[PDB]
Amino acid sequence: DAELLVTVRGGRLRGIRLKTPGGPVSAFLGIPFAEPPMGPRRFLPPEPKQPWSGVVDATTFQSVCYQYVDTLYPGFEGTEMWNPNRELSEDCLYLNVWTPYPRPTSPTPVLVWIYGGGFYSGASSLDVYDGRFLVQAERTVLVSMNYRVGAFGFLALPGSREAPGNVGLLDQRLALQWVQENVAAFGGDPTSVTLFGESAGAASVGMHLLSPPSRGLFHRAVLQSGAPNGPWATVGMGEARRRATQLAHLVGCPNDTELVACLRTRPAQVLVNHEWHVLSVFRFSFVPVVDGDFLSDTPEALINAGDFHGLQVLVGVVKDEGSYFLVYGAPGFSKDNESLISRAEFLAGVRVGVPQVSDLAAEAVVLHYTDWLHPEDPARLREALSDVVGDHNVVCPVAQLAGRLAAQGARVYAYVFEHRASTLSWPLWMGVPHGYEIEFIFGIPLDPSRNYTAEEKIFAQRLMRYWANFARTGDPNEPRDPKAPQWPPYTAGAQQYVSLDLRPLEVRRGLRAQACAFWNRFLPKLLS
Amino acid sequence: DAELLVTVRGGRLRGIRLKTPGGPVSAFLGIPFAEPPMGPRRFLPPEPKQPWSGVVDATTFQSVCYQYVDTLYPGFEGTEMWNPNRELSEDCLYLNVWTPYPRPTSPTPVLVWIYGGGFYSGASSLDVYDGRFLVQAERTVLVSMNYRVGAFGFLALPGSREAPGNVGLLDQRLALQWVQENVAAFGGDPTSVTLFGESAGAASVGMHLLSPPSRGLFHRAVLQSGAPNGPWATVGMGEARRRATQLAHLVGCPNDTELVACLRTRPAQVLVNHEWHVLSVFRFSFVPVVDGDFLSDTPEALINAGDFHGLQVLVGVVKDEGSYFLVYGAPGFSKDNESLISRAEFLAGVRVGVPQVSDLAAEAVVLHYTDWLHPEDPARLREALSDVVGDHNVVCPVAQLAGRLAAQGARVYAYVFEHRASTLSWPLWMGVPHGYEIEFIFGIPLDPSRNYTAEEKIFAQRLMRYWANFARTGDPNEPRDPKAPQWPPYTAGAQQYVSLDLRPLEVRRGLRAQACAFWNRFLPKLLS
């Protein structure tokens, strides 16, 4: 009750006590770290939040940033758990800070979450990102921000002062400068800050490694199912311009000053309602551009040039990365049936999964992913197209990144997440889809109101420990403790990684190595 | 002793009685079936042998046709067993006929052997082609011919009357017309004639299937380690011309009439001595051309168009097709050491194994054959390059052929030969190289003067039975007899085949299917 008042550079705050079967936690939800980016500020870099008199209420999540809402399947958990759970508003630059009770008395290490969502969706307030269980169980400090998405975050007319692009990334940065200035007040150690994110959050964390001005602001990194070198995670100057112009057109706008002037007068919902027709699966309209500025060169270029001495990184993927994307465009697919596609369907699906490449490139994808004893087996065709989408978008970019980092000075650990939640509502055939590790890392199966199993509970705890050990010491392994089977670093040569699963750790070699060689070494030669 | 005189259309012959641990056999070795192709006949189609008075001696093998002699390794069995074992001469169009003792009293089925040797070498007289053991053990009639090789067989200046090409193939044909006219005299059934050959003999048998004038002359076919659709088995009109002209140049010759006139005056040995500098491994200078005549279109074209209803075929390969070719040009290789090559060596070797393709094509070969967990393992690199040479030259053309035949009316059986002879002198690392099944089919391990093991002897017998059952009935399987594990036809869909081995038959699916898809479906798109 004493522990719920805290003063930070901007002024005073009041928090709320949250429960956990193991005991309570103090949360400060809804803290403003920037001026609302409204009116003439729509599309500009964020500016720091002005100080305030009085006590700001931080007992409740603030507004979700404006975003498209998935509505394919009203009532469906699988889909609705990703959708906004507070009112939409352009006024959304708030962050949240969980801290243990009692407050810690030395500086303690800080985990900062960056939500995924394809850069077009997501909120720090989703049930599945609740920081209470992780902070309780491992006495770390946890911070999450909201950051602008879609046009409001990533519309770009390259080299104009009025919509420069990458402002969502700047939002994230501002929250990270904020953590530097204020986490001490919550008992948090600003000299031990570990970023972690999924999907576009992982791409985001990636981009922070490669942006000199953000490297100052953290010490370690965790990329779950995502990387900044994705074919979906960034976009070229011309393409960004073309996408911006088309959005403008579609809302009746009409020279850059005039374009962004006109855009600035449209209701936020009007923009959102046209985001999707500017573009396939696993492609999103407004993603980070390569401007020369937040990124001085392509993510690929910067990874290759970079020095990563004295940096620890945890990276990983789920069993079935590509699966859930398929019911968003691939012919023959539906979540409500087994999706046993035919071969014709498989070939047409490959052009959807791997959009605009030479037919020569498509053929080569088809050879590589067909089993020639069973070229027409519907179930095998389903799994394969799944892999195509998975490998191309997530597993291969991650493996490239992982390898290049280890080879260049970084200590790197790697996983594959292989447990299907007992509570999942997507169909059996999708396996362990994109995003379905997150709830285990966040400790959600401890919430008694939810229906997880006993082993599920234990597993979640191991997961929180790995993550927290990584955060504290740059190594997931149980600080000083064999047997507890060991987790070896991933190197370019031995390419070692572990399976996270109800079973004890197993070590394995090569993150889909044969297929990655195809995407990473062969295929380029042949777009070219 | 009565059984050693026989009259045939051309006149009378005397044969010789040969021994076999199981009992004797009658051979007629050295029968002329064509006029000597000497002088002005050098390079022309063969003409039929004129009749003779008196009794021709057929108790001994005739002359080997002119050919390059391998001399890399004097004294070496591995090499010398393929070299000529009678005097070389242009006078070489003789054939041989083994028949059981006592002579059979109904028409019995005839096996005709066509030796391999890259179309540049080979003789019906090699120890390893001795027909005695097979005729004794399965009471079939066996016939082998000599046919012209190298320039004398396959020099071609397309569409001239003076060196039309394909005369070696015509030689073979003439022996097959001969069998039609005379095998009856040895107790042989001219309405049941099964061709069988290895390497270029297999390619040869292949070309007979696709030549309307030869289809009349046999009923079944067996292609061991070879096919006519090989990238080495045929050559284009222009390339043949270029190769002929260069040979001419190299022996100081000098218009086609004038060129072949001048060539006709050179000593046969002079031609042989320059065969090799007109051209890599698994490529030979004088091979069948696609002239429009003996073959009306490419082997590939004719296979695709063809109707194979009512035709039985046995096809197969050895475990390690590519291995022995490597010490003929691939850097890092030697038979006298483990040939543990480096990666640089492996990449340079790929250009030797797969000569004149785009670098883009080479890369793709390298991706496909590298293991990316072990990209630098010398032993794996050895095996892989072996496979490259194997798959490209033998396994993939055979599989294409096999599949296209089954799909188009033919009954087809398929094997992989997986026993290393206990007596082999090539190094361990080469496995079961090209040609090393032949001695088991011919029953050689029964010869007591040779040092084979007991199980080896039994195995040879099973092999002779399979071959002989195929010859008699179009089906290798033990006419009426389960258990004796069954051998299923090979179809385009299930692609089933068996392992010939000391162990009982095992059934398997797919003749290197993943790799064949690369050679057969992908790679073409990308030379193009």
Swiss-Prot record, chains A, B:
It is a peripheral membrane protein. Glycans are attached at N255, N337, N451. PROSITE patterns: CARBOXYLESTERASE_B_1, CARBOXYLESTERASE_B_2. It holds the Pfam family AChE_tetra. Gene3D superfamilies: alpha/beta hydrolase (3.40.50.1820). It is found in: Synapse; Secreted; Cell membrane. Keywords: Blood group antigen, Cell membrane, Disulfide bond, Glycoprotein, GPI-anchor, Hydrolase, Lipoprotein, Membrane, Neurotransmitter degradation, Nucleus, Secreted, Serine esterase, Signal, Synapse. Coiled coil: none annotated. Its EC number is 3.1.1.7. One of its GO terms (molecular function) is acetylcholine binding. One of its GO terms (cellular component) is plasma membrane. Disulfide bonds join C65-C92, C253-C262, C396-C516. It comes from the Eukaryota. The active site is at S199, E321, H434. InterPro entries: AB_hydrolase_fold, AChE-related_enzymes, AChE_tetra, CarbesteraseB, Carboxylesterase_B_AS, Carboxylesterase_B_CS, Cholinesterase. Huprine W binds at G118, S199, W426, H434. SUPFAM superfamilies: alpha/beta-Hydrolases. Hydrolyzes rapidly the acetylcholine neurotransmitter released into the synaptic cleft allowing to terminate the signal transduction at the neuromuscular junction. Role in neuronal apoptosis. Belongs to the type-B carboxylesterase/lipase family. PANTHER family: ACETYLCHOLINESTERASE (PTHR43918:SF11). This is Acetylcholinesterase. It comes from Homo sapiens.
